[PDB]
Design a protein around this ligand. Structure first.
Ligand SMILES: [Zn+2]
Lengths: 73, 31, 72
């Protein structure tokens, strides 16, 4: 499936993912495309910050869901 | 020390404090 | 019982419902009044998005509760 990743500016990123991919897998995909290191990425879906180890379906993130990306220093 | 979840003024949706606009309806956070 | 559905533009809509009505029943009722397809309706109550599985009583939604209609 494909999902979207939206930053605070509204810039949207398109990822191709399996519902089985972990949040770490997804952060690495964001890192390749965007150059943000995973430890500086906060992903947020349905008002909750996601866990590195957990997977996309653990959060019932499905095809075309939009995750929000927020920085950290 | 980031702040509590906040309820959107437009739809009540309970947001992560790191989002500046409502995740559901996109209304900017009310202060 | 009555409940209200408030849209993102201020419009408040009055519905006739039963506590045993499912979220999809509620969406179909909104379609019947406003002509919005259920597939485009998100219902928000008490900070939570309501899921097609449950009934109003599941969500402890009582007489004259206001739901919020988010179109997506
Ligand atoms: Zn909202």
């Amino acid at each position: 499936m494909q999902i979207f990743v939206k930053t605070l500016t509204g810039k949207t990123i398109t990822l191709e993912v399996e519902p089985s991919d972990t949040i770490e897998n997804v952060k690495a995909k964001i890192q390749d495309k965007e150059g943000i290191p995973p430890d500086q990425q906060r992903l947020i879906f349905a008002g909750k910050q996601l866990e590195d180890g957990r997977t996309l379906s653990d959060y019932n993130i499905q095809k075309e869901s939009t995750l929000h990306l927020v920085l950290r220093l | 020390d980031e702040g509590a979840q906040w309820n959107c003024t437009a739809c009540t949706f309970l947001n992560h404090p790191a989002l500046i606009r409502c995740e559901q309806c996109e209304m900017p956070r009310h202060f």
